[PDB]
Design an enzyme around this catalytic site. Structure first.
Site, PDB file in Angstrom:
ATOM      1  N   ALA A   1       0.848  -1.187   0.000  1.00 48.17           N
ATOM      2  CA  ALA A   1       0.000   0.000   0.000  1.00 48.17           C
ATOM      3  C   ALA A   1       0.874   1.222   0.000  1.00 48.17           C
ATOM      4  CB  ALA A   1      -0.874   0.032   1.254  1.00 48.17           C
TER       5      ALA A   1
ATOM      6  N   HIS B   1       8.912  -7.350  13.261  1.00 43.79           N
ATOM      7  CA  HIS B   1       9.906  -6.289  13.426  1.00 43.79           C
ATOM      8  C   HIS B   1      11.261  -6.677  12.811  1.00 43.79           C
ATOM      9  CE1 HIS B   1       8.058  -3.950  17.115  1.00 43.79           C
ATOM     10  NE2 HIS B   1       7.191  -4.096  16.128  1.00 43.79           N
TER      11      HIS B   1
HETATM   12  C1  LIG Z   1       0.940  -6.457  11.751  1.00 45.10           C
HETATM   13  C2  LIG Z   1       2.024  -5.486  12.144  1.00 45.10           C
HETATM   14  C3  LIG Z   1       1.867  -4.739  13.311  1.00 45.10           C
HETATM   15  C4  LIG Z   1       2.835  -3.816  13.700  1.00 45.10           C
HETATM   16  N1  LIG Z   1       2.611  -3.050  14.837  1.00 45.10           N
HETATM   17  C5  LIG Z   1       3.356  -1.879  14.983  1.00 45.10           C
HETATM   18  C6  LIG Z   1       2.978  -0.860  15.872  1.00 45.10           C
HETATM   19  O1  LIG Z   1       1.957  -0.911  16.575  1.00 45.10           O
HETATM   20  N2  LIG Z   1       3.782   0.252  15.946  1.00 45.10           N
HETATM   21  C7  LIG Z   1       4.943   0.395  15.202  1.00 45.10           C
HETATM   22  O2  LIG Z   1       5.626   1.407  15.351  1.00 45.10           O
HETATM   23  N3  LIG Z   1       5.339  -0.593  14.348  1.00 45.10           N
HETATM   24  C8  LIG Z   1       4.547  -1.715  14.236  1.00 45.10           C
HETATM   25  N4  LIG Z   1       4.942  -2.679  13.343  1.00 45.10           N
HETATM   26  C9  LIG Z   1       6.242  -2.484  12.619  1.00 45.10           C
HETATM   27  C10 LIG Z   1       6.257  -1.320  11.628  1.00 45.10           C
HETATM   28  O3  LIG Z   1       4.943  -1.035  11.167  1.00 45.10           O
HETATM   29  C11 LIG Z   1       7.173  -1.665  10.460  1.00 45.10           C
HETATM   30  O4  LIG Z   1       8.412  -2.084  10.994  1.00 45.10           O
HETATM   31  C12 LIG Z   1       7.424  -0.475   9.546  1.00 45.10           C
HETATM   32  O5  LIG Z   1       6.186   0.024   9.065  1.00 45.10           O
HETATM   33  C13 LIG Z   1       8.340  -0.863   8.383  1.00 45.10           C
HETATM   34  O6  LIG Z   1       8.683   0.286   7.651  1.00 45.10           O
HETATM   35  P1  LIG Z   1       9.657   0.196   6.374  1.00 45.10           P
HETATM   36  O7  LIG Z   1       9.838   1.566   5.819  1.00 45.10           O
HETATM   37  O8  LIG Z   1      10.892  -0.572   6.728  1.00 45.10           O
HETATM   38  O9  LIG Z   1       8.866  -0.731   5.314  1.00 45.10           O
HETATM   39  P2  LIG Z   1       7.359  -0.698   4.768  1.00 45.10           P
HETATM   40  O10 LIG Z   1       6.507   0.276   5.509  1.00 45.10           O
HETATM   41  O11 LIG Z   1       6.878  -2.109   4.736  1.00 45.10           O
HETATM   42  O12 LIG Z   1       7.504  -0.118   3.284  1.00 45.10           O
HETATM   43  C14 LIG Z   1       8.009  -0.832   2.167  1.00 45.10           C
HETATM   44  C15 LIG Z   1       7.188  -0.375   0.963  1.00 45.10           C
HETATM   45  O13 LIG Z   1       7.784  -0.898  -0.216  1.00 45.10           O
HETATM   46  C16 LIG Z   1       6.783  -1.459  -1.063  1.00 45.10           C
HETATM   47  N5  LIG Z   1       7.477  -2.435  -1.891  1.00 45.10           N
HETATM   48  C17 LIG Z   1       8.020  -3.625  -1.511  1.00 45.10           C
HETATM   49  N6  LIG Z   1       8.669  -4.196  -2.546  1.00 45.10           N
HETATM   50  C18 LIG Z   1       8.554  -3.327  -3.590  1.00 45.10           C
HETATM   51  C19 LIG Z   1       9.024  -3.360  -4.901  1.00 45.10           C
HETATM   52  N7  LIG Z   1       9.865  -4.301  -5.321  1.00 45.10           N
HETATM   53  N8  LIG Z   1       8.743  -2.299  -5.730  1.00 45.10           N
HETATM   54  C20 LIG Z   1       8.003  -1.226  -5.294  1.00 45.10           C
HETATM   55  N9  LIG Z   1       7.528  -1.175  -4.004  1.00 45.10           N
HETATM   56  C21 LIG Z   1       7.823  -2.215  -3.188  1.00 45.10           C
HETATM   57  C22 LIG Z   1       5.762  -1.998  -0.092  1.00 45.10           C
HETATM   58  O14 LIG Z   1       4.518  -2.252  -0.721  1.00 45.10           O
HETATM   59  C23 LIG Z   1       5.754  -0.909   0.985  1.00 45.10           C
HETATM   60  O15 LIG Z   1       4.811   0.127   0.747  1.00 45.10           O
HETATM   61  C24 LIG Z   1       3.997  -3.626  12.929  1.00 45.10           C
HETATM   62  C25 LIG Z   1       4.140  -4.388  11.762  1.00 45.10           C
HETATM   63  C26 LIG Z   1       3.171  -5.313  11.359  1.00 45.10           C
HETATM   64  C27 LIG Z   1       3.359  -6.104  10.090  1.00 45.10           C
END
Ligand SMILES: Cc1cc2nc3c(=O)[nH]c(=O)nc-3n(C[C@H](O)[C@H](O)[C@H](O)COP(=O)(O)OP(=O)(O)OC[C@H]3O[C@@H](n4cnc5c(N)ncnc54)[C@H](O)[C@@H]3O)c2cc1C
Length: 565
Positions: free
Chosen positions: A82, A502
């Site tokens: 998303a 995480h």
């Molecule tokens: C169910 C759940 C509950 C959680 N609870 C909490 C909470 O209460 N509070 C908190 O702080 N954290 C919580 N966490 C952890 C936290 O939400 C995540 O660690 C954090 O959002 C990850 O951020 P990010 O930028 O690393 O990746 P993401 O936010 O996952 O972003 C990666 C993005 O890249 C996109 N993508 C992937 N591959 C490709 C591709 N090849 N080409 C183009 N786009 C791509 C994805 O669709 C996504 O939008 C939770 C996680 C989960 C799954």
């Protein structure tokens, strides 16, 4: 199809970078996102909707390999597909890290990464709405000095928050166990009991995901471009004479199946999440040559710890039944090792100390020798010292009113030692990765989890909470009798755990000489102009919920990128 910057992944971290870089009107930024807007998705916006989107079209539902130390079953690893990424499906909790555990980043060799250096960026990200009088009465509190008032990310407490018997009893019961209420877990000292805030827009009463924070209020920017429903497969490189790799652009596959290219004049920022960014690197020829060659990929950069050093947590849940209706605030408790283990702490510490070198030796093999014995011993010593000397929290314990007479607890060990990896399974960019977190690999990881479960069982039967709670219902005394040995607890935990979602460390920020993938400016080693900015870069796990720290890291990264330009 040429832009100054390409940001791969419009998620939690990527949207921050795109926002900040596009502040300069003369700089063009392209966001690539595999999913699409969830602005109008009611299961995302729902302030109380955590869980509803699990298994939906906006959940990637990645899957691990058999977890050989945890009873063998595979585990779902959830992630948001998303605009806004995983912030759209997460639990909305806003908690940070222990000051000393961020300080460790600089200790291990990442210049400029300390609590004091990161704090201004936590502040920059945040707009906290102060609690109302009714929310204060329920226990809501904050330290104004450590909360931002002007950042894109709205933070606050539910409009539904009201005082009740359960949260008052928990406060008293934890204090009696030696763990006091604290006004704010987000000032670098997390130990204590707290009515934690959430990533919530209280003006609108909706989830405050990363897109509502960092994208939509800025989507009129002509220099900011978004391609939704667009998957980045890999980077391609400029062809020159020098060893250092210069990214030319990103190969993309659109919803209609067409494979094309976009180009970056300055840098490519990879923000696809800890379970995708290292794969994008591997498909681009940055990674372990043995893995690349097995998949007929020529290495552009020999960087064999790409995908290594994967660190995740696992959670479990318990429950109780009240004599009557239970009500109040949702609470978090962050106990230290001595809070959990009391008088057995010294013995637990001695056992763990005697195991560190052996943990390291096992982890060397996980990485096929690409993390060295000496290096892992030192990394594990840093974590040991945080636990034992700095007394950082070793558990998160959530308590929730479950409706009616029900109370639930969700909990996890914060700092397991197990490391695993993630790697491509093929050169096909649609092929599922081999993901192996190695849950329960090391004795501490399970022993601490069992200690936390036992601690919760004790809390449920301790005063004054025991006046409200008639009995434990999960596991309960039938499933796990009072006299059950630790193995019964560990077996039950293994049968019932979930990934805590995480994952960190798969493109870890550490000196290259200790096995790092990115430098202290988040630049991928061996490249001039590729960065990873997402959970992949965290070199160790943190004590709190990840988004707060990921927003802060991405905010700081954005300033480093601007400085380099
Ligand atoms: C169910 C759940 C509950 C959680 N609870 C909490 C909470 O209460 N509070 C908190 O702080 N954290 C919580 N966490 C952890 C936290 O939400 C995540 O660690 C954090 O959002 C990850 O951020 P990010 O930028 O690393 O990746 P993401 O936010 O996952 O972003 C990666 C993005 O890249 C996109 N993508 C992937 N591959 C490709 C591709 N090849 N080409 C183009 N786009 C791509 C994805 O669709 C996504 O939008 C939770 C996680 C989960 C799954």
């Amino acid at each position: 199809t040429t832009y100054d910057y390409i940001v791969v992944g419009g998620g939690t971290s990527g949207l921050v970078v795109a926002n900040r870089l596009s502040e300069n009107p003369d700089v063009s930024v392209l966001l690539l996102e595999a999913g699409a807007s969830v602005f109008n998705n009611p299961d995302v916006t729902n302030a109380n909707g955590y869980g509803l989107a699990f298994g939906s079209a906006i959940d990637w539902q990645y899957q691990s390999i058999n977890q050989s130390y945890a009873g063998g079953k595979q585990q779902v690893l959830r992630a948001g597909k998303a605009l806004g990424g995983t912030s759209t499906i997460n639990g909305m909790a806003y908690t940070r890290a222990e000051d000393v555990q961020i300080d460790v980043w600089q200790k291990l060799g990442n210049e400029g990464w300390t609590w004091k250096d990161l704090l201004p960026y936590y502040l920059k990200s945040e707009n906290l709405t102060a609690p109302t009088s009714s929310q204060v009465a329920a226990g809501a509190a904050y330290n104004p000095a450590v909360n931002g008032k002007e950042g894109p990310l709205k933070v606050g407490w539910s409009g539904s928050l009201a005082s009740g018997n359960l949260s008052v009893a928990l406060n008293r019961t934890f204090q009696a166990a030696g763990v006091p209420w604290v006004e704010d877990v987000n000032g670098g000292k997390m130990r204590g009991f707290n009515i934690y805030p959430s990533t919530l827009d209280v003006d609108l009463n909706v989830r405050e995901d990363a897109a509502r924070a960092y994208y939509f209020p800025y989507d009129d920017r002509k220099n900011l471009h978004l391609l939704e429903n667009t998957t980045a497969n890999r980077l391609f490189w400029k062809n020159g004479s020098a060893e250092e790799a210069i990214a030319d652009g990103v190969e993309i596959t659109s919803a209609d199946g067409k494979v094309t290219r976009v180009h970056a004049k300055k840098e490519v920022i990879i923000s696809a999440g800890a379970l995708r960014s290292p794969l994008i690197l591997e498909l681009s020829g940055v990674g372990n040559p043995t893995i690349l060659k097995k998949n007929n990929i020529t290495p552009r950069v020999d960087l064999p710890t790409v995908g290594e050093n994967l660190q995740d947590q696992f959670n479990n849940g318990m429950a109780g039944e009240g004599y009557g209706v239970l009500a109040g605030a949702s609470t978090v408790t962050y106990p230290s090792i001595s809070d959990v283990f009391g008088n057995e702490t010294d013995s637990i510490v001695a056992s763990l100390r005697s195991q560190l070198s052996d943990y390291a030796a096992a982890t060397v093999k996980v990485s096929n020798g690409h993390m060295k014995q000496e290096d892992l011993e030192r990394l594990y010593q840093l974590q040991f010292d945080l636990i034992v000397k700095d007394k950082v929290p070793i558990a998160e314990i959530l308590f929730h009113p479950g409706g009616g007479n029900a109370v639930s607890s969700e909990f996890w060990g914060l700092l397991p030692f197990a490391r695993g990896n993630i790697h491509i399974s093929s050169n096909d960019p649609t092929a599922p990765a081999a993901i192996n977190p190695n849950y329960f690999m090391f004795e501490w990881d399970g022993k601490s989890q069992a200690g936390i479960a036992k601690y919760i069982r004790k809390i449920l039967r301790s005063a004054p909470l025991n006046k409200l709670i008639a009995k434990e219902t999960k596991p309960g005394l039938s499933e796990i009798p009072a006299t059950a040995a630790d193995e019964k607890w560990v077996e039950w935990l293994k049968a019932n755990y979930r990934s805590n979602f995480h994952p960190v460390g798969t493109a870890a920020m550490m000196p290259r000489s200790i096995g790092g993938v990115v430098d202290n400016r988040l630049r991928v080693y061996g490249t001039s102009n590729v960065r990873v900015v997402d959970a992949s870069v965290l070199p160790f796990q943190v004590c709190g919920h990840l988004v707060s720290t990921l927003y802060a890291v991405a905010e700081r990264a954005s300033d480093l990128i601007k400085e380099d330009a």
